[PDB]
From a paper:
[name]-β is synthesized as a latent form (L-[name]-β) containing a 25-kDa N-terminal latency-associated peptide (LAP) and a 12-kDa C-terminal growth factor (mTGF-β) domain. Notably, LAP remains non-covalently associated with mTGF-β after cleavage, which prevents mTGF-β from binding to [name]-β receptors. Myeloid lineage cells present the latent form of transforming growth factor-β1 (L-[name]-β1) to the membrane using an anchor protein [name]. Integrin αVβ8 activates extracellular L-[name]-β1 to trigger the downstream signaling functions.
We used a αVβ8/L-[name]-β1/[name] ternary complex of 2:2:1 stoichiometry for structural determination, in which integrin αVβ8 contains only the headpiece involved in L-[name]-β1 binding (i.e., residues 1–594 of αV subunit and residues 1–456 of β8 subunit). To understand the interactions between integrin αVβ8 and L-[name]-β1, we focused on one αVβ8 headpiece and the L-[name]-β1 dimer within the EM map. The best subclass of our 1:2 αVβ8/L-[name]-β1 complex was finally refined to a resolution of 3.24 Å, where the head region of αVβ8 shows clear EM densities, including the β-propeller and proximal thigh domains of αV subunit and the βI and hybrid domains of β8 subunit. In contrast to other integrins whose headpieces adopt an open conformation upon ligand binding, the αVβ8 headpiece remains closed in complex with L-[name]-β119,31. The absence of a metal ion in the conserved adjacent to metal ion-dependent adhesion site (ADMIDAS)19,31 is observed in our αVβ8/L-[name]-β1 structure. In our structure, the RGD tri-peptide (215−RGD−217) of L-[name]-β1 inserts into the cleft between αV β-propeller and β8 βI domains, similar to the reported αVβ8/L-[name]-β1 and αVβ6/L-[name]-β1 structures. However, the adjacent proximal loop (207−INGFTTGR−214) and integrin-binding (IB) helix (218−LATIHGM−224) of L-[name]-β1 undergo tremendous conformational changes. Interestingly, rather than forming a continuous α-helix with 218−LATI−221, His222 of L-[name]-β1 flips outward and disrupts the secondary structure of the IB helix. Instead, in our 2:2 αVβ8/L-[name]-β1 complex, His222 is stabilized by Thr87 and His88 of L-[name]-β1, and His118 of integrin β8 through van der Waals interactions. Moreover, Tyr172 of integrin β8 forms hydrogen bond with Thr212 to fix the proximal loop in the new position.
Numbering used by the authors:
A (entry chain B): 72 to 395, 404 to 424
B (entry chain A): 1 to 454, 474 to 501, 519 to 540, 559 to 588
C (entry chain D): 76 to 193, 207 to 239
Write the structure that this text describes.
């Protein structure tokens, strides 16, 4: 049934105190359909990155034409929460934060879904030009909320179950954390559901920023691969965040800020070459131990799995389920799942 | 482990007013009646033009648990010119932080949007209201001539406050110097004496505060949580501040000096973006007379057996020594996404065993996110890892925003005069403030003598307690063979000798009916003693 | 009476930050000669040229050191000025008529002035997200030249 993962389902019965291992074969394929999303910050600190993003549209298609065979592209923007002290609530500055500079800039917004994933690219070049720049007061810019909203709301974005989901988030500075909203007064957590009324996050002033762990769990559940394209000194900061976020890598952008297509190519190649698997087990009494086998011959069990792997290279995952409902074990970023059913007795 | 869970004092308030955001005790020295302080930042007042201004309700502890708010500033928005609002008190979140000394009540609004003299922008500076008796004064530390977010524009004063034993008040505003932070400490006498409503800057003569740091120190959130404690042994409590945003978003704790703001020690978190220093409390745990530092990290991710990261939370305890070195012990969370360590509040010597006790609560744990509160005891070497008592919320979620039981609590203040510091827990989601009373703790020693072992069985026992207790107690015992059982209702006075008798493995039960006092507190047995021998 | 004109500077990222990317010690304003020739062709027709700058809220001490580009390999000193400690964006005017007149007929790739110490169009002074935003009144070269037909 399943394509990438060889066993569709394995049903094993085991008495407590005795172990019962099985075989979990993984065979990555070639020419993965790609659904790439652009979560770009339109804050005032990126008056040049917005114009740098202009030319990616037609050019990246040529590069992707010989990795994948079908490409679908979308767009998105985010600034920050529409509250104080993040933004200025002055009557003259509530709608335009560039009044003191006498500049025409977009009003700040939590998250706006400008354009969904479409085969048409001409829609992308039309969409990049009609969106202006925005800004606010405080240095950090809330991006994790935009990631959560672009991941959970699958219907609005238009993700495909048969394609490799890709959410490429670009920032230069640090993002707002979960409990930073206590200054504004919002003191209860994000639920994590869909709250996009009409391509706009209306629930940006009544709920806090999502937790890092909750965001990672939602990304894993939605099979979303994230590329952290950054240009500032915070490249190191986002690089140290990679162990915290499973199936996520970060790349560097130069000051001249034109290696976006190459960065995307390298990120896609790295994501395809990494195979990591984690088990989301809810059954009580069972213990999960995973022993990964690499094509290179180096036995490297654990969450890291095997790197530098391509097609026609079968990666083995020896799992020994023991005892002291079903549990789903699946690779990160793979559209298929390996659900195991156990006999409770 | 002595908290009464079968009859907690429950306080109601205005619906949808965050009743229970800040809870604190009120124990006036002049009067013999000790009141209570609860916060409701979203409670509508009688002020003209003020919507959801907020108020600090004062609740009584007597049988008629009726509550009423305290009048602090019963007037509308001030004016700077004709048809010009000098203040924007709407949505000011008044009463977010409440701290009370013997007879001084300090209610602080962190969203006090005072328009500046010249720029006249709605930047919130944050003020406080200090009341001691009939006279009331207004305290505005962040309101000064350094305007805009550079110096003090978004200072947001009154976010976290504390009172020093040396008759001093510590105020921390995390938004100063582009959200770097500040620690403004002032003497109560100067504020009380110099109260001129005409002047706004209200510059003081003994005002010491941290100055602006370097550019890379931006977004530090200094003063996010404040505490008072003695470290160098000079007779004045030092200042402890939580810094969960410095060190390139790693987590830090800054310790200053109450004399001239000298940096004594520092702390650093281990995990990036782990919220190190979100809530800091200073209290002793091993009875060495040295004030230790308690630091809790709500959002902490740990590595499991399979490497799957789980957000359970982590609380770090620092054991201060005579030399000055700090021994840090990490207490991991118990439930995923429970935000363990969000609120930390000392309880003092809860069970009167010498060592003090502390409480750490998880506001989003349990079934349906009803909030879980953990009670931790104290040892000579740190504190007991496993919890000693579990407190659970009995109210479900009214709306999407969860009740968050245990988000803020106050303790270490005796109210019923039994010698046991009671604890109040306030949840703003369901607009209730719950007070838990400490049941009497009776330590009991049991001894069985059998001679010869190859017959005479003669069991003996004694009872002792701390505080006010009934003079006479009732105990029920039992007998087992290998009539096989003999029950007996005996009476042992407090401090008595071996109550020995013979009958021709024992289990003892305390009578919860006759031992109950007039209020209804049933004495609880010691959990650290065994109930059977041989 | 005399005709006036304005010569805008180059973009901060296009040509200003080409080799002098981080000129923290002194802010640099660069120009090229094509726009100066467009403003007025005749070097002798330039009756007067002025440099317009917007002062910041220093209010402590202002000492500006004015160097100029001699053959793009040395420095040239003309004069110095001070800014009154006033919390207002006051307008500054410098007499650079000789330099502009010399550069109008002198072929070159880029020319500029050093403003050392011993502003609109640049960093405002609010560190963070409101630092690198540009606005109008970007530093330009004010010119007062007579029309060719009249003279
Ligand atoms: C526990 O952690 C604490 C937090 O990390 C730490 O506190 C930090 O201590 C260090 C040193 O002990 C301290 O660094 C000093 O900061 C001084 C300002 O408070 C600074 O004074 C100079 O700068 C002031 C403002 O800086 C601006 O202006 C400067 C020009 O004046 C400019 O160069 C700067 O870049 C910036 O724009 C200024 O007002 C003042 O007049 C001084 O000029 C110190 O500078 C020293 O270094 C210069 C060379 O750069 C020398 O000329 C001279 O020796 C100066 O003294 C110095 O940088 C941090 O500020 C503290 N941080 C906080 C927050 O308080 C504790 O020390 C730690 N405890 C332990 C036991 O480790
Ligand atoms: C996860 O992604 C995989 C890779 O994109 C999917 O695998 C392939 O799915 C295609 C679906 O678009 C299949 O194409 C169709 O397959 C059916 C067989 O059931 C044929 O009748 C159709 O003609 C064919 N359509 C074409 C070729 O246009 C591929 O055959 C299939 N395998 C390969 C090697 O490409 C997974 O389906 C997807 N999983 C889920 C749950 O969506
Ligand atoms: C406080 O008073 C206001 C109005 O007197 C109540 O209504 C809130 O304010 C306006 C009314 O036009 C609405 O936009 C808000 O949505 C109302 N709030 C809610 C929660 O409905 C408000 O309910 C009062 N609050 C309390 C706690 O009594
Ligand atoms: C005021 O601050 C000064 C400087 O921070 C303090 O002087 C130092 O204090 C520490 C703490 O005991 C000593 O270890 C140093 O030897 C002192 N001298 C230095 C650093 O040169 C001073 O103690 C503080 N208090 C008072 C009352 O002056
Ligand atoms: C979308 O692509 C189709 C395919 O050629 C093309 O005909 C159409 O014009 C494109 N849309 C736009 C808006 O250009
Ligand atoms: C699980 O298996 C691994 C690899 O075989 C080995 O370290 C050990 O047997 C188990 N490890 C743990 C941590 O349970
Ligand atoms: C998996 O590991 C177990 C030991 O835990 C071993 O007995 C078994 O043979 C291994 N399976 C494979 C396919 O190597
Ligand atoms: C002891 O006291 C209990 C309750 O007061 C009573 O029910 C019982 O009859 C008494 N006597 C014995 C032998 O238990
Ligand atoms: C150079 O001069 C031309 C003249 O048309 C002008 O358009 C341009 O902005 C100037 N600066 C450059 C090319 O950096
Ligand atoms: Ca921001
Ligand atoms: Ca001290
Ligand atoms: Ca101690
Ligand atoms: Ca104790
Ligand atoms: Ca009590
Ligand atoms: Mn920004």
């Amino acid at each position: 049934i399943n394509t990438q993962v060889t066993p569709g389902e394995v049903s094993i019965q085991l008495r407590p105190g005795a172990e019962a291992n099985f075989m979990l074969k993984v065979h990555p394929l070639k020419k993965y359909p790609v659904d790439l999303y652009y979560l770009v910050d339109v804050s005032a600190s990126m008056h040049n990155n917005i114009e740098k993003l202009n030319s990616v549209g037609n050019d990246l298609s040529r590069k992707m034409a010989f990795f994948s065979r079908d490409f679908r592209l979308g767009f998105g923007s985010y600034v920050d929460k529409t509250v104080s002290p993040y933004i200025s609530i002055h009557p003259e500055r509530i709608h335009n934060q560039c009044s003191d500079y006498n500049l025409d800039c977009m009003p700040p917004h939590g998250y706006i879904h400008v354009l969904s994933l479409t085969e048409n690219i001409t829609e992308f070049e039309k969409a990049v030009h009609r969106q202006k720049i925005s800004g606010n007061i405080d240095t950090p810019e809330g991006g994790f909320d935009a990631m959560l909203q672009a991941a959970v709301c699958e219907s609005h974005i238009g993700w495909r179950k048969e394609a490799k989901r890709l959410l490429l988030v670009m920032t230069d500075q640090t993002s707002h954390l979960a409990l930073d909203s206590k200054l504004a007064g919002i003191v209860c957590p994000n639920d994590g559901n869909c709250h996009l009324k009409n391509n706009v996050y209306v629930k940006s002033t009544t709920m806090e920023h999502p937790s890092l762990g909750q965001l990672s769990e939602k990304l894993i559940d939605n099979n979303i691969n994230v590329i952290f394209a950054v240009q500032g000194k915070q490249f190191h900061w986002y690089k140290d965040l990679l162990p915290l976020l499973p199936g996520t890598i970060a790349g560097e952008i130069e000051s001249k800020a034109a290696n976006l297509n190459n960065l995307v190519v390298e990120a896609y190649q790295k994501l395809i070459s990494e195979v990591k698997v984690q088990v989301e087990n809810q059954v009580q009494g069972i213990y999960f131990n995973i022993t990964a086998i690499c094509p290179d011959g180096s036995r490297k069990p654990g969450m890291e799995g095997c790197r530098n792997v391509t097609s026609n290279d079968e990666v083995l995952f020896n799992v020994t389920v023991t005892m002291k409902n079903y549990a789903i074990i699946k690779p990160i970023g793979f559209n298929e799942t390996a659900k195991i059913h156990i006999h409770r007795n | 482990f002595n908290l009464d869970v079968d009859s907690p004092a429950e306080y109601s308030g205005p619906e949808g007013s965050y009743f229970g955001f800040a809870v604190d005790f009120f124990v006036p020295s002049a009067s013999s009646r000790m009141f209570l302080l609860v916060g409701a930042p979203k409670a509508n007042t009688t002020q003209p033009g003020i919507v959801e201004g907020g108020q600090v309700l004062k609740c009584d502890w007597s049988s008629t648990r009726r509550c009423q708010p305290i009048e602090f500033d019963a007037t509308g928005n001030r004016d700077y010119a004709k048809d010009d609002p000098l203040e924007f008190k709407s949505h000011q979140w008044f009463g977010a932080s409440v701290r009370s000394k013997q007879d001084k009540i300090l209610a602080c609004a962190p969203l006090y949007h005072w328009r500046t003299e010249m720029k006249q922008e709605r930047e919130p500076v944050g003020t406080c209201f200090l009341q001691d008796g009939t006279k009331t004064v207004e305290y505005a530390p962040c309101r000064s001539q350094d305007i805009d977010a550079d110096g003090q524009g978004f200072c947001q004063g009154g976010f976290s406050i504390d009172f020093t034993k040396a008759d001093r008040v510590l105020l921390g505003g995390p938004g100063s110097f582009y959200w770097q932070g500040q620690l403004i400490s002032d003497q109560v006498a100067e504020i009380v004496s110099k109260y001129d409503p005409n002047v706004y800057s209200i510059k003081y003569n003994n005002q010491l505060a941290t100055r602006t740091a370097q550019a890379i120190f931006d977004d530090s959130y200094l003063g996010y949580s404040v505490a008072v404690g003695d470290f160098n042994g000079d007779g004045i409590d030092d200042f402890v501040s939580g810094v969960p945003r410095a060190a390139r978003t790693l987590g830090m704790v800054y310790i200053y000096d109450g004399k001239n703001m000298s940096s004594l020690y520092n702390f650093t978190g281990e995990q990036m973006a782990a919220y190190f220093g979100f809530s800091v409390a200073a209290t002793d745990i091993n009875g060495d007379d040295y004030a230790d530092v308690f630091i809790g990290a709500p959002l902490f991710m740990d590595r499991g057996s399979d490497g799957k990261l789980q957000e359970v939370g982590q609380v770090s305890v620092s054991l201060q020594r005579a030399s000055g070195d700090f021994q840090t012990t990490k207490l991991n969370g118990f439930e995923v996404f429970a935000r363990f360590g969000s609120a930390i509040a000392p309880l003092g010597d809860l069970d009167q065993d010498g060592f003090n006790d502390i409480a750490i609560a998880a506001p989003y744990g349990g079934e349906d996110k009803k909030g879980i509160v953990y009670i931790f005891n104290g040892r000579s070497t740190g504190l007991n890892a496993v919890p000693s008592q579990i407190l659970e919320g009995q109210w479900a979620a009214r709306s999407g925003c969860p009740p968050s039981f245990g988000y803020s609590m106050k303790g270490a203040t005796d109210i019923d005069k039994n010698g046991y510091p009671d604890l109040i827990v306030g949840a703003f989601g369901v607009d209730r403030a719950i007070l838990y009373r400490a049941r009497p703790v009776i330590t009991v020693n049991a001894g069985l003598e059998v001679y010869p072992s190859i017959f005479n069985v003669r069991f003996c026992l004694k009872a002792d307690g701390k505080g006010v207790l009934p003079r006479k107690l009732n105990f029920q015992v039992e007998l087992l063979l290998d009539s096989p059982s003999h029950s007996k209702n005996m009476t042992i006075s407090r401090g008595g000798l071996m109550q020995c008798e013979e009958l021709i493995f024992m289990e003892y039960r305390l009578d919860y009916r006759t031992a109950a006092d007039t209020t209804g507190l049933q004495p609880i047995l010691n959990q650290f003693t065994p109930a059977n021998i041989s | 009476a005399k005709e006036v004109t304005r010569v805008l500077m180059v973009e901060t990222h296009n040509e200003i930050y080409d080799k002098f990317k981080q000129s923290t010690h002194s802010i640099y304003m660069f120009f090229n000669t094509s726009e100066l020739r467009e403003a007025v062709p005749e070097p002798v027709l330039l009756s007067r040229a002025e440099l317009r700058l917007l002062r910041l809220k220093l209010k402590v001490e202002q000492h500006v050191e004015l160097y100029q580009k001699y053959s793009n390999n040395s420095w040239r000193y003309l004069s110095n000025r001070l800014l009154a400690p006033s919390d207002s964006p006051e307008w500054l005017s410098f007499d650079v008529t000789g330099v502009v007149r010399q550069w109008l007929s002198r072929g070159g790739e880029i020319e500029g002035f050093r403003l050392s110490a011993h502003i609109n169009g640049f960093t405002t002074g609010r560190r963070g997200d409101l630092a690198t935003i540009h606005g109008m009144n970007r530093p330009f070269l004010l010119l007062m030249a007579t029309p060719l037909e009249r003279a």
